[PDB]
Design a protein around this ligand. Structure first.
Ligand SMILES: O=CCCCC[C@@H]1SC[C@@H]2NC(=O)N[C@@H]21
Lengths: 566, 678, 85
């Protein structure tokens, strides 16, 4: 009918239905939300600074961070003493190591935030980081995993949060075939929590297991020995394609200098006990002997160069690309996010978020009239086709069917998946249970777990209960996890668990007010005591923590990380 | 005297580049000024340093005179030239510049303030003794007073009224000895137009032609009037085309125009360059003062072509800097002699077919006329824009000025014709076609045109060439090829190709069909408006693969069967196809075909809309009943165990509520009927 | 000219301040005014800003595509002006 184009015009124009046009009006509601978000990011963006240069914050105005006041002078004294030795006490080794003008990720940050409670009731162990810093680095045109042991040995070298971080880094590198670089500085072991860190599985032995399984798959790895690595820490220099020992302060020992005493205590110099022995000794241990920190870093870079990965990365990830920005300003991402601590769940939207994040502000909807709860479709993220699952409302059987169908197509055509978690939302109606809802949930989870597609999840907010099993979860092998500040990970019910557990717990009929004070308030305190900031990341649950505004850049880092894969 | 090494400019545009250029010859520094952005503009690429001033609105930019003065003081500027517009006429700014110690370029503040009010200015000229036609004498105290001064103060009778342009009291009563009709006419004018009963009498002129002499003065009491000018042609008080040598003007008169002009300028006191404007009636043969401007005009380079001083080319801006230098003149009124004739025309980025409304858009391709000497004529073009620039809506629409100096008027007018034709711009409609129409058919080559000359010939003008069916053929072909490989590598079986283009010419859609026979991409045909023919087409290099807003600009060749051949540079976009060639310029709008492609739902939506589940308890409805809902806002929010679960209906049309807040409703209830707006 | 230091700054200094526009200069005219001459404009702190920025960009993608977490970027340049870093 008076309409005869050739699909384009209708396409390739600034007026295709594919795009999205949710324009906000900045009203009170927007302000209430936008403002809060701002109230939910300032310190997130801040604590980072405090742990960075940990314990030395000369401004002394860090009231925006709820961190307790710490003895700045002690940390400054320790840093001065350490830097007088001739080694750089910072993450400086990293940004010296990575090529200028390139990107970085800082995979796990704020690790071990106020984790352990000391004997002093008001004092926690001052683990500003997990004892290491981990991030994806691009060296000499080669993408690599960077792990650096921090010089914080006051509490002890490695904790249940340190070895877990190291093992997570090793698993990520092995999955993605990114070579690792380890910067080694250790105080040995922790002889206090040794039962928690040495024996059992997924412990310090699995590091040695991984450093051999990698070299089986011919994924070369490199370690730099800046200081002592004793107590089983001396095997990494031994199990290494290339290793670096600094001329003066680089030391490697299987038995400590105190250990020779009380067992043939003919004590001699710490150099002769296994440290950097530049005298043409009989031992052929340690590939590189470098006179200075810069010399060692330079030789590490030079060894990284001769791996032939530059051609493969350059072919797989195009270095010269034209950035395509979204149609709407990314600062608006905080506004559509609702507020917090609201008796009844507030309202929420997804279209706006996806239209703000994706390229050209576009989307490819599958069936949206049907199973209106769940959202699935294709997209574009900086030159790469992506699939997104974002959740909105209370799940039905049909939503699970649609999810299974989408995941089937994505696995069929080798399209990566992105997850945006939300509430559990399993209806409890008797008719729904009689309609085989459990079978359809199983249909969804089977497809989720069976998918060989790389998978990344990011918390939008309100991910509580067994609903994440429908979409995705840490136990379903997501190659990366990141989080927004307004996140709560809890039991099958965030608010309802309060009501349900109020009924069935040794409660007399009378004393109703005192009981609800003792029951409902207490369970609310329990189920929102956990949050994005503490229960997560600090314990390497969903290790990555980010800002809602800069999500697309992070996801693009992740996707470039997962295309060197076999 | 005071040395000058730094020059400051206020305004932007053609004047900025002009002031900047001569400056190079005097070997003086330059400074540029620009609004938000506006940094790619040419003038800033011509100066030595440029400073951003602030927000686009003229209140925010180029009007903060105090901020400009403070910035100039920080730069230790020597001189400032305001130019025309913005702070061109503001005595406070000039006084502040004088207090700061910077040499202001132009008249003193006293002259500007005095000429700001018309009443005090005309008072000054009346005291000076210059023939001035006043606007009023007293009031209508007595009806016999009208007969008393009718033959006294002003024999020509201008009855009119105290105010209002109706003027039915005039009756065009040019006959003196009128006493029984003038009073009746005035009394019938008073009816339904009472206003104030005071009536003013003046001289009435049948014809009007505008004259404006130029003048120059140092600060050491010495000056010399430049040659006269004509501004008869103007539409809606906007200058269109002007001539420095007033054709049909006796030499003796020229001389006298000067003596009158010098008297007025001396009386008020004046320094620098300025222009006195007159009003003239051919029938009376006398000139009467109308207004003067204490500011450099835009028409300065025009009068220059008809005046030489000591046999050397004259530069008007040069002297103004030398006047600011404090040096005295070197020539009397005599050293200046006229030589030849010249004409000028202004091009405006407006649409003649429309209500002369300015348009803003990127400048795709700008042809530049030959600005060199040849034959018996000199033709020049001055433009304040270049390729890749974009017109700003805040500024006035002004592209370039074209001037044709010659030894005789004929040569000058003829020269322009060809030049006006040659200059070409693609991207925005212009009045260039209008000006050429103003030059060909009107027999104003004689030289006699009145102030209202444009008004009567409006029927004759506003006319453009008819788009021949052939023009569609080249225009249609370019859009395909300048977009894709249509007709390139095409192939079918036992058949022949076909591809069609729809043009929305005027308010009627136009369809053109193109097809081929044989194995030839070369041999092509056409059928538009039931007219069929054949032609061949050979393209050029392929350019602009990115096909951005500028899209593709390529030359084309078309060999039609009859025998002709054509060359066409086509910058085609989805919105329109522009073809420039010997035919001229024509832009053909492509039939628009867009209408929410997807969301095209005419469903009635009678019932069972935004139904809520069993728990119900609707509340906090934020939509008004009977208001259009195309975007999917939250029509109703129902709560089921803290489940807001907003429905978010996207059905277009107004929504009618049958429920109220706080009312518990049953499962799948008809909360509202979302129906098409009827 | 860029690439080698020249005396062009000297000649301009010889032309501006010395009042030799009068036209009377002796054979030893250069000898007495050596204190006045041999003078060049002072490098303002702004000049370092454009000069420092160019070296990065005119060498690599510094500040191009850069990104960190909950922080902001930083990059420094060291100039050996005169004998003082
Ligand atoms: O409309 C009424 C049904 C409410 C369903 C609430 C769902 S069922 C599973 C999950 N656990 C809760 O406590 N609430 C949600």
């Amino acid at each position: 009918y008076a309409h005869h184009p050739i699909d384009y015009e209708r396409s390739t124009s600034k007026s295709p239905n594919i795009l999205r046009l949710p324009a906000n009006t900045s009203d009170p509601t927007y302000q209430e939300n936008m403002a809060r978000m701002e109230g939910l990011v300032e310190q997130l963006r801040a604590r980072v600074r405090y742990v960075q240069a940990g314990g030395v914050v000369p401004e002394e105005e860090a009231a925006k961070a709820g961190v307790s006041i710490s003895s700045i002078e002690a940390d400054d004294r320790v840093r001065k003493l350490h830097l007088s030795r001739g080694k750089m006490l910072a993450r400086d080794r990293i940004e010296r190591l990575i090529d200028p003008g390139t990107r970085f990720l800082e995979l796990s940050q704020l690790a071990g935030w106020d984790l352990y409670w000391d004997d002093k009731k008001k004092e926690y162990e001052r683990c500003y980081s997990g004892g290491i810093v981990t991030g994806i680095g691009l060296v000499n045109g080669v993408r690599c995993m960077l792990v650096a042991n921090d010089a914080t040995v006051k509490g002890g070298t490695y904790y249940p949060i340190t070895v877990k971080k190291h093992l997570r880094a090793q698993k990520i590198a092995e999955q993605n075939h990114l070579p690792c670089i380890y910067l080694v500085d250790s105080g040995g072991a922790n002889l206090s929590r040794q039962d928690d860190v040495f024996p059992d599985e997924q412990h310090f032995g699995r590091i040695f297991y991984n450093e051999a399984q990698m070299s089986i798959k011919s994924i070369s790895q490199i370690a730099v020995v800046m200081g002592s690595c004793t107590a089983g820490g001396a095997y990494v220099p031994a199990m290494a394609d290339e290793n670096i020992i600094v001329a003066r302060n680089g030391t490697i020992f299987l038995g400590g200098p105190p250990l020779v005493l009380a067992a043939t205590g003919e004590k001699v110099s710490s150099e002769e006990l296994g440290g950097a022995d530049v005298h043409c000794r009989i031992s052929g241990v340690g590939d590189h002997y470098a006179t200075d920190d810069l010399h060692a870093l330079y030789l590490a870079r030079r060894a990284v160069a001769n791996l032939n990965l530059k051609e493969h990365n350059e072919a797989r990830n195009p270095t010269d690309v034209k950035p395509v920005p979204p149609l709407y300003d990314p600062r608006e991402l905080g506004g559509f996010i609702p507020d917090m601590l609201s008796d009844v769940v507030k309202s929420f939207d997804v279209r706006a978020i996806i239209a703000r994040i994706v390229d050209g502000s576009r989307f490819d909807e599958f069936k949206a009239l049907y199973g209106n709860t769940l959202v699935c479709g294709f997209a574009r993220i900086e030159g790469m086709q992506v699939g997104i699952i974002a959740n909105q409302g209370i799940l039905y059987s049909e939503s699970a069917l649609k999810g299974a169908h989408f995941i089937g197509l994505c696995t069929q055509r080798n399209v990566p998946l992105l997850f945006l978690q939300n509430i559990t939302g399993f209806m409890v109606g008797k008719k729904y249970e009689e309609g085989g809802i459990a079978r359809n949930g199983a249909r969804l989870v089977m497809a989720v777990s069976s998918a060989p597609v790389p998978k990344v999840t990011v918390l939008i907010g309100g991910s509580y209960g067994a609903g994440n099993y429908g979409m995705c979860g840490r136990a379903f092998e997501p190659r990366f996890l990141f989080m927004w500040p307004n996140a709560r990970i809890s039991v099958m019910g965030g608010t309802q668990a309060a009501t349900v557990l109020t009924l069935t717990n040794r409660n007399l009929k009378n004393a109703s007010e005192a009981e609800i004070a003792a029951f409902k308030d207490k369970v609310k305190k329990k189920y929102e005591k956990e949050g994005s900031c503490y229960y997560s990341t600090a314990r390497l649950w969903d290790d990555g923590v980010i800002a809602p505004e800069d999500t697309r850049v992070v996801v693009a880092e992740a996707l470039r990380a997962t295309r060197l894969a076999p | 005297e005071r040395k000058v090494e730094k020059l400051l400019v206020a305004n932007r545009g053609e004047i900025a580049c002009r002031v900047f250029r001569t400056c190079r010859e005097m070997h003086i520094r330059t400074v540029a000024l620009f609004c938000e952005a506006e940094r790619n503009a040419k003038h800033v690429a011509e100066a030595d340093e440029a400073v951003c001033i602030g927000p686009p609105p003229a209140v925010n930019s180029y009007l903060r005179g105090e901020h400009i003065i403070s910035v100039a003081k920080q730069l230790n500027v020597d001189a400032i030239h305001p130019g025309y517009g913005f702070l061109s006429e503001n005595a406070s700014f000039a006084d502040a510049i004088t207090r700061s110690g910077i040499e202001f370029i132009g008249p003193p503040a006293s002259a500007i303030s005095l000429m700001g009010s018309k009443s005090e200015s005309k008072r000054i000229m009346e005291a000076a003794g210059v023939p001035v036609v006043p606007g009023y004498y007293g009031e209508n105290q007595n009806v016999s007073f009208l007969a008393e001064e009718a033959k006294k103060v002003g024999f020509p009778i201008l009855i009119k009224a105290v105010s209002g342009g109706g003027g039915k009291g005039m009756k065009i009563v040019e006959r003196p000895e009128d006493f029984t009709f003038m009073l009746e006419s005035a009394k019938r004018e008073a009816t339904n137009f009472f206003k104030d009963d005071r009536v003013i009498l003046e001289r009435y002129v049948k014809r009007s032609r505008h004259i404006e002499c130029q003048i120059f003065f140092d600060k050491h009491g010495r000056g010399v009037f430049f040659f006269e000018r004509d501004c008869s042609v103007q539409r809606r008080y906007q200058k269109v085309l002007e001539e420095a040598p007033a054709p049909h003007l006796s030499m003796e008169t020229r001389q006298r125009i000067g003596e009158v002009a010098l008297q007025a300028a001396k009386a008020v006191g004046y320094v620098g360059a300025g222009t006195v404007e007159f009003i003239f009636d051919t029938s009376t043969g006398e000139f009467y003062f109308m207004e003067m401007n204490t500011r450099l005009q835009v028409e300065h380079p025009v009068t220059e072509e008809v005046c030489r001083i000591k046999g050397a080319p004259l530069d008007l801006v040069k002297l103004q800097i030398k006047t600011a230098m404090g040096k005295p003149l070197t020539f009397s009124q005599e050293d200046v002699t006229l030589v030849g004739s010249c004409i000028e025309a202004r091009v405006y980025a407006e649409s003649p077919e429309r209500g002369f409304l300015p348009e803003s858009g990127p400048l795709t391709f700008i042809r530049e006329p030959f600005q060199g000497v040849r034959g018996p004529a000199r033709t020049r073009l001055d433009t304040g824009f270049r390729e890749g620039d974009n017109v700003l809506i805040h500024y006035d629409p002004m592209l370039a000025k074209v001037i044709s100096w010659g030894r005789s008027r004929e040569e000058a007018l003829r020269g322009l014709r060809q030049a006006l034709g040659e200059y070409k711009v693609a991207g925005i409609n212009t009045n260039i076609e209008f000006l050429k129409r103003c030059c060909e058919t009107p027999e104003f080559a004689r030289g006699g045109v009145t102030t209202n000359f444009i008004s009567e010939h409006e029927s004759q003008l506003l006319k453009s060439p008819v788009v021949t069916p052939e023009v569609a053929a080249m225009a249609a072909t370019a859009w395909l090829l300048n977009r894709c490989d249509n007709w390139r590598g095409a192939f079918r079986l036992n058949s022949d190709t076909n591809a069609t283009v729809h043009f929305y010419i005027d308010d009627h859609p136009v369809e053109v069909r193109l097809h081929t026979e044989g194995a030839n991409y070369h041999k092509i045909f056409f059928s538009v408006w039931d007219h069929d023919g054949s032609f061949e087409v050979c393209s050029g290099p392929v350019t602009s693969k990115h096909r951005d807003q500028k899209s593709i600009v390529n030359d084309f060749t078309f060999l039609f069967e009859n025998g002709m051949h054509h060359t066409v540079l086509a910058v085609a976009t989805e919105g329109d196809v522009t073809v420039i060639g010997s035919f001229g310029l024509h832009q053909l709008r492509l039939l628009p075909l867009t209408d929410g492609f997807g969301d095209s739902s005419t469903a009635g939506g009678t019932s069972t809309k935004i139904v809520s589940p069993m728990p119900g308890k609707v509340s906090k409805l934020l939509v008004k009943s009977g208001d259009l809902v195309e975007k999917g806002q939250v029509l109703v929010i129902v709560e089921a165990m803290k489940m807001e679960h907003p429905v978010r209906a996207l059905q277009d049309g107004r929504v009618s509520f049958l429920v109220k807040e706080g009312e518990v409703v049953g499962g799948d209830h008809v909360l509202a009927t979302v129906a098409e707006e009827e």
